[PDB]
Amino acid sequence: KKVRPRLIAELARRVRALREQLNRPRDSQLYAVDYETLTRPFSGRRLPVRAW
Amino acid sequence: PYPPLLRAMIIAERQKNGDTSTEEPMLNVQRIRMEPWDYPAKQEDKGRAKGTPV
Amino acid sequence: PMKGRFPIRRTLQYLSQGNVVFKDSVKVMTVNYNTHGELGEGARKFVFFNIPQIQYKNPWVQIMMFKNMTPSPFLRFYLDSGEQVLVDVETKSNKEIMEHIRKILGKNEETLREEEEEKKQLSHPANFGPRKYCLRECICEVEGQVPCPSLVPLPKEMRGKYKAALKA
Amino acid sequence: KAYRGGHLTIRLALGGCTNRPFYRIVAAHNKCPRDGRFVEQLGSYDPLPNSHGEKLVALNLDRIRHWIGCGAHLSKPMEKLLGLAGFFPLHPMMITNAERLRRKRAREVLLASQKTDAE
Amino acid sequence: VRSSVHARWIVGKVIGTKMQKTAKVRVTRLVLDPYLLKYFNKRKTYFAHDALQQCTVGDIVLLRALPVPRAKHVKHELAEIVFKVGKVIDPVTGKPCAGTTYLESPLSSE
Amino acid sequence: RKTRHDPLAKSKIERVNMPPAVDPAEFFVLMERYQHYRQTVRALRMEFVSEVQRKVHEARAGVLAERKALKDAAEHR
Amino acid sequence: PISPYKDEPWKYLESEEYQERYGSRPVWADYRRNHKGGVPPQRTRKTCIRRNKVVGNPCPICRDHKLHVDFRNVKLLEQFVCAHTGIIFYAPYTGVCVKQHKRLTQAIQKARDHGLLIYHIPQVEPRDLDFSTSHGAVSATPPAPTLVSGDPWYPWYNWKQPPERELSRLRRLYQGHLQEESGPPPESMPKMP
Amino acid sequence: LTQGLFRGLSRQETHQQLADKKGLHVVEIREECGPLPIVVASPRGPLRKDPEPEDEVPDVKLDWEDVKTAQGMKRSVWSNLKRAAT
Amino acid sequence: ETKKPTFMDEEVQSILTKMTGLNLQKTFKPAIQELKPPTYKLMTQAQLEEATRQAVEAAKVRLKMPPVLEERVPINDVLAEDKILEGTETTKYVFTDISYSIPHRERFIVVREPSGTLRKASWEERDRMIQVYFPKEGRKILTPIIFKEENLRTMYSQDRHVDVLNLCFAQFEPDSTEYIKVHHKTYEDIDKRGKYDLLRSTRYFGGMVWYFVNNKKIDGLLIDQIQRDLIDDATNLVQLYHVLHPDGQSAQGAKDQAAEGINLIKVFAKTEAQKGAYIELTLQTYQEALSRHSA
Ligand code: FES
Ligand SMILES: [Zn+2]
């Protein structure tokens, strides 16, 4: 009845949280825009037409 | 005012309990302050895009 | 035939004939009785005939028996508040014992009637669903409403196969 | 099945058979399947006119007020049913769609008259 | 008065006193046999905290649930010794007895 | 439906969602109707919430609940 | 064949031909199903008349073309109802095919609906405990002020022409993606002449 | 089977024999007739004055098949099958 | 000042209860239904008399007279006239409050018309919606055809008047127009053919008597009671008639003459009775047979 511990799950959970704080993208990366195509180079997603 | 059905049920409940008041039921909307939809929201409680550069 | 003396005791009908439904305070009921002696006869019949009926109506109350530990038989109830209720049963018959405990620690007929009514509110007649939970499965079972297509084919005008055909 | 976040909603669960729709009004977690687990059934809605030419709608108003008071949301078709019953105000789009229908038929009546005048 | 322990009050028989300040108690309940419709005893073990180490193997005790378990298996405490082994006091008369016989007649103190 | 790990369809890469056209008169009228409608519905929701809280308190510490609690306690003694 | 009793089917049961063939016993008394084993199938055959052809052992109804299952021929219908319990015998009881058993069940129910066939009608209790009609749900509700004056329940139900400055503001906000400005709608719903 | 059947059927006690043996009225209760008591047999001799003793629990032997059927626990695909009128 | 009695007055209920009678054999007639094997008990003479006493008590509950109500007034109340909804729907909506713990006569049942009007449902719509969501055993959403005039005459020809009243009681409400129409047509058929014995020992006899007394047509029932040696009932019928018609020719004649017992039937037979001649003859025949038994 005693659930077998899942150590790899806890290990990976902490490693992911750590890498998300040490490799976090900055505002200059997230919120940059290509004014010719009107897309964000960080994700390649276009902006809505009403904001162009 | 109350919606038509809600009003009729509030009045019917008065008369069942012996109340003979003729005052109209009324919704108080003073406490309901309607903000414009473009009112600045709380930035502290807003999320942030996660790391995954293309 | 069914084994043992008085096999009627081992029937659901007999077990449901108990009229003692303890209040929520009763947590334990100990029974001290003697196997021999004319003055403990009613307590022995109480253990033989009624204890099963009491346990059946009160499944979560602990009932523990003790034989020949004291000179006379008695019942003792332990309540949730910590109070203990001693009941001397020597010389009393098993029917007088059942009527006694029902009076001091049993729910009255009024309290039981109310509980049964609050249960009926869980199966609303107007709700539709499986037979296990509802009287009717679909509104099509109500006379006057459009019946189920599995029994009465719908007019061609009320079928999408011909609505799209005409529109297309 | 504990969902991430979510909330209760009063909405229409589709029943019946092909070409014979029938709705059950239910309070359920918004993440649950349309016709799956619900918290409580609050009424029903038969959209097909019966032999008396009526669309029957059952509303458990006592329990509808209870679940709204417990933080339950309302789907848009449910809000319009309550507006038609007089329990809520008429939804803004029931009023606007009615005006659109009036302007639409005012143009058709004008086109019909112009055609008869030419004839 | 609240408690996270399921069994709030239970009576049982002490079957072990080898743990320090802990009495091992056997508790029996009547469980209906669905096929035979006959009640049979179903026994379960409980560890009860006994601060004064006054429990003896064979005595009948009353256990009270603790607010929270004090150990992995210790969820109750000794609330009262109902029947001390070999030293029973008749609750009906308050006199000492040995089985179904009085050791002091109830007529002694009238 | 897709998961966030499934790739975007290639036939939808260049899709640009153009917003609808706006009728100024109807747009403004509809905007005022939603404000009035949602103000009235919020006033109703507040009353229903107060009813739910009143019934819970009444069943816990009401005059009929505390009275029935003392009666039961008296009958027990 | 053509039965001369199709118009007045109750006459056949009163004729001498019927009395000689059946006497005072039910028409299904001497019928027996042919089947293997001791336990018969739990459904009778679907029909004894298949494309105007009769099977070899036709059921009590199908073997006599003068017996007409009609809601008025109550003397025939009573033979398929238990006189002590009022229940309709299931088809294997008498051996009638499924086709005729359905026609019997419908004729029996139709005869009861017309009062031609006696059945037990219990004595029920009233629906309501109180018969008062004073509650507002079944009485008059004091009309609201708007309903008396003839106004909409809420003022925002009506169309109100917006100011010109607010329309200019929206024409700038959505410049290049505008429709034609709509005016007040008709006061009533038009109708096709 | 035949010999046993005739033995049982020939050794049955009628209601009149029961009334004469116990000197009491034999009253029949029918659910279709409600609480109406129906006297089916009365003793030809004198009628007793002391009621029949009402044992709180009868010590009669029960048939498990009858009890199991009354409790809905009897499951058989061969019971209660539709058959021709007998 | 001086109110005339109602149907549920203790004095009227006591009179109609005695006139109804209590026949255990008819009140507890064997029903044609699914049967079970009967049970048997051994009883002394005292236990049998007690069992018979309890049966009489259970019968007096089964003979409880339904209250006679006046016809309900039609419902015509508008809650709102939302003209903006005109022409947006082709079918009307019926909204029923199905909250469990509400008396059915207090439930709100409203209708949204295609014209935009929100009105309360009519009595016929109410009873139909209540049966849809709170189905009562024995009631149908669609009116059975048995209540048509052609089918009721078939029931009357078979002397099944009590079945008609049992069907009517299960289908319609006591204050409904259909309920009152069927009861009056059944009472009138009993009066025309002298079938008053069909309703004796039933819960419908009092309602029938109440109908004859109010409509001043007790001559038939009065003759039936004298022919059956029920003068105690025939005398109460004339007294109940005077109580509900105090300012009448017969009521005054009884006061002026201080009539009592059979004398009341003679005073009534001469003044207000329409078949006065047939009552005197029927009453004369009774007194003769009573004298022969005395001699
Ligand atoms: S089950 Fe109701 S429409 Fe098919
Ligand atoms: Zn056939």
DSSP letters, I19-38, are: HH---HHHHTPPP-S-----
Tokens at residue G173, please? 């906000």
- Which residues lie closer than 8 Å to I39 by C-beta, 6 or more apart? H28, H29
Chain C: closest CA distance from residue H2 (Å) = 23
C-alpha distances (whole Å) from G117 to each of E49, G124, I69, I160 are 79, 21, 32, 11
Nearest-angstrom CA–CA distance, D109 and G124: 58
Tokens at residue C125, please? 């007649």
Question: Which residue shows structure tokens 């009465």?
Answer: C152
Helix (H) or strand (E) holding F58: helix F24-61
Helix (H) or strand (E) holding D81: helix D76-85
Helix spans in chain I (H): 10-20, 24-27, 45-62, 123-133, 149-157, 161-171, 177-193, 205-214, 219-227, 231-244, 249-257, 262-270, 276-294
Nearest CA to I82 among I97, I93, I70, I68?
I93
Residues of B with CB below 8 A from I118's CB? 4-5
Residues of H with CB below 8 A from C5's CB? 59
Residues of C with CB below 8 A from H60's CB? 8
Helix (H) or strand (E) holding E96: strand E96-98
Q: Which of D12, D14, D22, D37 to mutate to probe the C interface, most C CBs <10 Å?
A: D22
CB count in 10 Å sphere of residue I189 = 17
Chain C: closest CA distance from residue H30 (Å) = 21
Residues of G with CB below 8 A from B7's CB? 141, 144
- Cβ contact, residue pair G141, B11, below 8 Å: yes
Helix (H) or strand (E) holding D82: helix D76-85
Ramachandran bin of A38, using left for φ above 0, alpha for ψ from -120 to 50, beta for the remaining angles: left
The half-sphere exposure of G173 on its side-chain side, counting CA atoms within 13 A, is 12
C-alpha distances (whole Å) from G127 to each of C119, D19, D92, I108, I171 are 21, 36, 41, 17, 10
Nearest-angstrom CA–CA distance, C51 and C71: 21
Nearest CA to G153 among F30, D77, B27, I87?
B27
C-alpha distances (whole Å) from H35 to each of A32, I30, I50 are 92, 11, 12
C-alpha distances (whole Å) from A17 to each of A12, A22, B35, D27, I79 are 9, 9, 37, 37, 61
Helix (H) or strand (E) holding F45: helix F24-61
Nearest-angstrom CA–CA distance, I71 and I91: 30
Nearest-angstrom CA–CA distance, D23 and D15: 6
Technique used by the depositors: cryo-EM
CB count in 10 Å sphere of residue H11 = 7
CB count in 10 Å sphere of residue B34 = 13
Residue to substitute in C134, C145, C148, C159 for testing ligand 1 pocket (most ligand atoms within 8 angstroms of CB): C148
Sign of CA dihedral B40, B43, B45, B50: positive
**Beta-bridge partners for D44:** D24, D58
Nearest-angstrom CA–CA distance, I263 and I253: 10
User: Helix (H, G, I), strand (E, B), or coil: what is residue I253?
Assistant: helix
- On whether the CB atoms of residues G175 and G167 are closer than 8 A, the answer is no
Ligand 2 centroid – CA G57 distance (Å): 9
- On whether the CB atoms of residues D44 and D25 are closer than 8 A, the answer is yes
Nearest-angstrom CA–CA distance, E43 and E47: 14
DSSP code string of B4-16 = HHHHHHHHHHHHH
Ligand 1 neighbours (beta carbon < 6 A): C 138, 140, 148, 150; D 16-17, 20
DSSP code string of I180-231 = HHHHHHHHHHHHHHT-GGGTTTSTTHHHHHHHHHHTT--HHHHHHHHHTT-H
CA dihedral C102, C108, C111, C113 (to 10 degrees): 110
- On whether the CB atoms of residues E49 and E77 are closer than 8 A, the answer is yes
The half-sphere exposure of H26 on its side-chain side, counting CA atoms within 13 A, is 18
Nearest-angstrom CA–CA distance, D115 and D113: 5
Question: Which residue shows structure tokens 């203790």?
Answer: I10
- Which residues lie closer than 8 Å to I29 by C-beta, 6 or more apart? H33
- On whether the CB atoms of residues G10 and G72 are closer than 8 A, the answer is yes
- Which residues lie closer than 8 Å to C101 by C-beta, 6 or more apart? C20, C75, C77, C87
- On whether the CB atoms of residues G111 and G74 are closer than 8 A, the answer is yes
Find the length of chain E.
Answer: 110
Q: Is G61 exposed, middle or buried (0-12, 13-18, 19+ CB in 10 A)?
A: buried
Tokens at residue D82, please? 């309550």
Buried b (16+ CB within 10 A) or exposed e, G27-45: bbeebeeeeeeeebeeebb
- Cβ contact, residue pair I100, C135, below 8 Å: no
Tokens at residue C146, please? 């459009």
Nearest-angstrom CA–CA distance, G96 and G59: 5
Give all strands of the β-sheet with C26-33 in edge-to-edge order: C62-67, C26-33, C74-79, C84-88
List subunits contacting chain F, requiring 3 or more Cβ pairs under 8 Å: A, B, D, G
Nearest-angstrom CA–CA distance, G103 and G82: 17
Side chain identity at residue C38, one-letter code: E
Question: Which residue shows structure tokens 């902006």?
Answer: A47
- On whether the CB atoms of residues E18 and E56 are closer than 8 A, the answer is no
List the domain range (segments joined by +) for residue G51: 2-122
- What is the C-alpha radius of gyration for chain E, rounded to an integer number of angstroms? 17
User: Helix (H, G, I), strand (E, B), or coil: what is residue G54?
Assistant: strand
Nearest-angstrom CA–CA distance, I200 and I29: 13
Side chain identity at residue D98, one-letter code: A
User: Helix (H, G, I), strand (E, B), or coil: what is residue C20?
Assistant: coil
Angle, alpha carbons I190-I195-I200 (nearest 5°)? 105
Q: What is the largest CA-CA distance in chain C?
A: 97
Which own/partner contact pairs does I189-195 have at CB distance under 8 Å and 24+ positions apart?
Answer: I189/I156, I189/I161, I190/I161, I191/I217, I191/I220, I191/I221, I194/I220, I194/I223, I194/I224, I195/I159, I195/I161
Angle, alpha carbons I132-I133-I135 (nearest 5°)? 70
- Cβ contact, residue pair B15, G142, below 8 Å: no
Q: How far is CA D27 from the centre of its chain?
A: 14
Q: How far is CA I191 from the centre of its chain?
A: 14
User: Helix (H, G, I), strand (E, B), or coil: what is residue C88?
Assistant: strand
Helix spans in chain H (H): 2-10, 15-22, 64-70
Nearest-angstrom CA–CA distance, G86 and F23: 72
Q: Does I118 touch chain B (CB under 8 A)?
A: yes
Residues of E with CB below 8 A from C88's CB? 92
Nearest-angstrom CA–CA distance, A41 and A24: 16
Nearest CA to G85 among I29, I28, I34?
I34
Residue to substitute in C134, C140, C151 for testing ligand 1 pocket (most ligand atoms within 8 angstroms of CB): C140
The half-sphere exposure of H51 on its side-chain side, counting CA atoms within 13 A, is 9
Residues of F with CB below 8 A from A39's CB? none
Nearest-angstrom CA–CA distance, D88 and D91: 8
List the domain range (segments joined by +) for residue B7: 1-34
Q: Does I108 touch chain B (CB under 8 A)?
A: yes
CB count in 10 Å sphere of residue E58 = 12
A3 secondary structure, DSSP code: P
Find the length of chain I.
Answer: 295
- Which residues lie closer than 8 Å to B3 by C-beta, 6 or more apart? D83, D86, D87, D88, D89, F44, G153
Tokens at residue I179, please? 């309920």
> Which ligand 1 atom sits closest to the C-alpha of C146?
3
Nearest-angstrom CA–CA distance, H19 and H48: 10
Tokens at residue H26, please? 């034999």
- Cβ contact, residue pair H85, G93, below 8 Å: yes
Nearest to C2 among H56, H64, H71 (CB): H64
User: Helix (H, G, I), strand (E, B), or coil: what is residue A5?
Assistant: coil
- On whether the CB atoms of residues E85 and E57 are closer than 8 A, the answer is yes
Chain G: closest CA distance from residue F70 (Å) = 32
CB count in 10 Å sphere of residue H64 = 14
Residues of G with CB below 8 A from F20's CB? 177
Give all strands of the β-sheet with I109-112 in edge-to-edge order: D73-74, D8-17, D20-29, D40-45, D54-59, I92-97, I109-112, I117-120, I78-81
- Total of domains in chain E: 1
Nearest CA to C90 among D38, I258, E90?
E90
Helix (H) or strand (E) holding I78: strand I78-81
- On whether the CB atoms of residues I212 and I271 are closer than 8 A, the answer is no
Q: How far is CA G64 from the centre of its chain?
A: 30
- Cβ contact, residue pair D22, C158, below 8 Å: no
C-alpha distances (whole Å) from G128 to each of F35, I165, I205, I238 are 45, 18, 22, 34
Nearest-angstrom CA–CA distance, I94 and F1: 38
- On whether the CB atoms of residues G45 and G35 are closer than 8 A, the answer is no
List the domain range (segments joined by +) for residue E58: 1-109
Chain I residues 18-37 within an 8 A CB cutoff of chain G: 31-35
The residue whose CA has the least distance to atom 4 of ligand 1 is C148
CB count in 10 Å sphere of residue F38 = 15
- Cβ contact, residue pair I42, H22, below 8 Å: yes
- On whether the CB atoms of residues A48 and A38 are closer than 8 A, the answer is no
Nearest-angstrom CA–CA distance, A20 and E11: 56
Q: Does G130 touch chain I (CB under 8 A)?
A: yes
Q: What is the largest CA-CA distance in chain B?
A: 73
Tokens at residue C51, please? 């204890």
Nearest to F19 among G162, G177, G180 (CB): G177
Interface present between I and A (3 or more CB pairs within 8 Å): no
Q: Does D96 touch chain F (CB under 8 A)?
A: yes
DSSP code string of D2-64 = --SS--EEEEEEEEEETTEEEEEEEEEETTS-TTS--SEEEEEE--S--TTSEEEEEE-HHHH
User: Helix (H, G, I), strand (E, B), or coil: what is residue E10?
Assistant: strand
Nearest CA to I75 among I47, I46, I105?
I105
> Which ligand 1 atom sits closest to the C-alpha of C137?
1
Nearest-angstrom CA–CA distance, G174 and B36: 19
Nearest CA to I282 among I294, I268, I272?
I268
- On whether the CB atoms of residues G81 and G44 are closer than 8 A, the answer is no
Across chain C, where does the E strand assignment appear?
Answer: 26-33, 62-67, 74-79, 84-88
C-alpha distances (whole Å) from I14 to each of E26, F61, I10, I65, I259 are 69, 48, 6, 11, 22
- Cβ contact, residue pair G190, D102, below 8 Å: yes
Ligand 1 centroid – CA C142 distance (Å): 11
Nearest CA to C58 among C99, C82, C25?
C25
Ligand 2 centroid – CA G6 distance (Å): 18
Q: Does F22 touch chain A (CB under 8 A)?
A: no
Q: Which of E1, E10, E39, E95 to mutate to probe the C interface, most C CBs <10 Å?
A: E39
The full set of domain ranges for chain D reads: 1-115
Give all strands of the β-sheet with E88-89 in edge-to-edge order: E88-89, E96-98, E101-102
Nearest CA to A19 among F4, B51, B53?
B51
Nearest-angstrom CA–CA distance, C134 and C124: 8
Nearest-angstrom CA–CA distance, F41 and A29: 43
- On whether the CB atoms of residues C20 and C57 are closer than 8 A, the answer is yes
Tokens at residue I13, please? 């209920």
Tokens at residue I29, please? 């007639």
Nearest to E9 among C27, C55, C63 (CB): C27
Ligand 1 centroid – CA C165 distance (Å): 24
- On whether the CB atoms of residues G101 and G47 are closer than 8 A, the answer is no
SS (H, E, C) B24-43: CCCCCCCCCCCCCCCCCCCC
- On whether the CB atoms of residues C75 and C104 are closer than 8 A, the answer is no
Nearest-angstrom CA–CA distance, B45 and B31: 25
What is the structure's resolution, reported in angstroms to one decimal?
Answer: 2.4
Q: Does B27 touch chain G (CB under 8 A)?
A: no
Per DSSP bridges, beta strands C74-79 and C84-88 are: antiparallel
Nearest CA to G152 among B4, F30, D106, I121?
B4
- On whether the CB atoms of residues G131 and I179 are closer than 8 A, the answer is no
**Beta-bridge partners for E78:** E63
The half-sphere exposure of I183 on its side-chain side, counting CA atoms within 13 A, is 30
Q: Is G26 exposed, middle or buried (0-12, 13-18, 19+ CB in 10 A)?
A: middle
**Beta-bridge partners for A34:** A39
Q: Which residues of B touch A (CB under 8 A)?
A: 48-54
C72 secondary structure, DSSP code: S
Helix (H) or strand (E) holding E97: strand E96-98
Helix (H) or strand (E) holding H24: none
Nearest-angstrom CA–CA distance, G181 and G161: 11
User: Helix (H, G, I), strand (E, B), or coil: what is residue G91?
Assistant: helix
- On whether the CB atoms of residues G26 and G85 are closer than 8 A, the answer is no
- On whether the CB atoms of residues I238 and I222 are closer than 8 A, the answer is yes
Chain D: closest CA distance from residue B29 (Å) = 14
Ligand 2 centroid – CA G7 distance (Å): 21
